Symmetry: C2
Subunit: 284 residues, 2 copies
């Protein structure tokens, strides 16, 4: 194989995502989004990125902020729901999560999980230092997470778990980088309880959804063995602490095949068996 | 066909040119302190698109008269492992450029990641980022979009098309397709808006412009502009052309660059270059 002078879209690419991945953006059909009664309207799926948004909102509800009540509407990314006119209008990039803030007289969109986390942390004044050097430390780790997850999911996850052919050079490239990123976190968590200081912030939440899912064996087949996750004992400590947070236990279940399809009221969780909200096990 | 082992082992080089630095472990590999100059901001960087975000931002602030944005930009040679000295790891645990130390107050502190540097500076000086209101959310959305998507352009497309030792059709196709999709996102936005997050230039534009302009104008990744049909993105081209004319862009692009200044330690340093370099875009080597 020799790359052509001009790339053309003529072959399938993406494995399980080959029915949605395209070289062009924009909507593929006309459909409006549903709107509920609560101030925050979230359009998402319970992947690590969706979980950032729904955990953040559940964290705010644990603190008593009624302005954080939310409707979490299901977006099925294997089905192309991210390409409806209504979804593209709230996220031009056609990825979950995306949100509409309806808490004021004029609604507006917020897209990208990092922007959603920042927006909510700034609105309520929690989980992000409002000023001082600690703010810069938190932002540094949050942007680090956003800039590095593509290597873990779009790189390692894709080539290890979804690509139709196993490609040694690509698997090696992204397995190596994923381990390096876990080592960055592990070395930080050897010296600090949380990534950006002594307290849990949005930088921890953002990293945790990805790292905990991989570390505890729930993501990408046998990846936890493949990547020698046992090496990262400080990551493990921090995953265990965050796993225990009530807002994490609730938020991780939203838009999830193992939890709630959607969330429209706090009482929706009463439909689940009590075991679904109990401690995330660590052993085998 | 290849069969992955049960447990991954680091048994083969990976990275092409970058195989002399890419590792599955983090942390410092030598003890060396960072140099420190006289100015309030100390930047440790290289004039890649990500380094240019930092140096352009500082030059934009100096363009507005903010003397508190004066800076030393020290060169970090990423092919040679300068990013793994103890001094550099101390300011960026992730060992990537740009990173900086804010020495403007009584206690210095690190800021790492280009997006965090842009936000830190925009918040400090109250410019290039709406301080409140729905426009702030729009700006942050586009800025995080840039940071979350550049890995597909550089770590995906650029790597497989330009650096990997073997041309891998599936990987080149995956990331060429995604790079084009991201250009199309920007192109469709810029068809309806002068800038990404509204009518005015913000840090979201600066962050995206360094990458998109370098690819679009033909200076990144060999023949990528022809390969990716850059001529298709006329609104990206219009926006690149507008940002190209800003003096802070023209100066900041030249910092830590093999076609500009190796380092910046004072505003007069630019008088070492041909004067035309400050007046029109210079394409990198
Ligand atoms: N940088 C983005 C990444 C979001 C992302 O990868 N979303 C995925 C699910 S986790 C998605 O919606 N993919 C749809 C698609 O690629 O078509 C963020 O942090 O929100
Ligand atoms: N178009 C995407 C569809 C899959 C997708 O969006 N995956 C998510 C995780 S479910 C991902 O890798 N997100 C990267 C990030 O968060 O930056 C692809 O082909 O990789
Ligand atoms: N998300 C990071 C990406 C920074 C990045 O990719 N830095 C590259 C040069 S542009 C680097 O220093 N690479 C060194 C290495 O990989 O060893 C940011 O926006 O700052
Ligand atoms: N370790 C890196 C070294 C090269 C590198 O860091 N490249 C930069 C551009 S020079 C990149 O793609 N950064 C991704 C980003 O900005 O998110 C690799 O092999 O990809």
């Amino acid at each position: 194989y020799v790359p052509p002078k001009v790339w053309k879209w003529d072959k399938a690419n993406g494995g399980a995502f080959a029915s949605v991945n395209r070289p062009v953006a924009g909507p593929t059909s006309e459909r409006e989004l549903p709107v509920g009664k609560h101030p925050f309207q979230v359009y998402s799926l319970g992947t690590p990125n969706g979980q950032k948004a729904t955990i953040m909102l559940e964290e705010l509800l644990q603190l008593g902020f009624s302005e954080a009540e939310y409707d979490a509407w299901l977006i099925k990314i294997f089905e192309g729901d991210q390409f409806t006119s209504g979804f593209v209008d709230i996220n031009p990039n056609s990825k979950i999560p995306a949100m509409v803030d309806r808490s004021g007289p004029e609604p507006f969109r917020v897209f990208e999980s990092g922007a959603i986390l920042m927006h909510l942390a700034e609105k309520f004044g929690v989980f992000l230092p409002t000023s001082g050097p600690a703010r810069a430390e938190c932002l540094s780790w949050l942007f680090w997470q956003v800039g590095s997850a593509p290597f873990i999911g779009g790189g390692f996850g894709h080539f290890y778990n979804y690509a139709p052919i196993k490609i040694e050079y690509a698997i090696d490239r992204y397995a190596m980088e994923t381990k390096r990123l876990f080592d960055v976190a592990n070395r930080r968590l050897a010296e600090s309880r949380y990534l950006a200081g002594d307290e849990y912030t949005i930088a921890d939440l953002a990293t945790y959804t990805w790292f905990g899912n991989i570390y505890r064996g729930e993501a990408y087949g046998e990846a936890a063995t493949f990547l020698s996750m046992h090496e990262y004992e400080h990551v493990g400590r921090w995953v265990g602490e965050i796993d225990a947070r009530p807002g994490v236990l609730r938020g991780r279940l939203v838009n999830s095949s193992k939890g709630l399809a959607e969330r429209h009221d706090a009482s929706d969780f009463d439909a689940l068996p009590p075991e679904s909200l109990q401690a995330i096990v660590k052993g085998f």
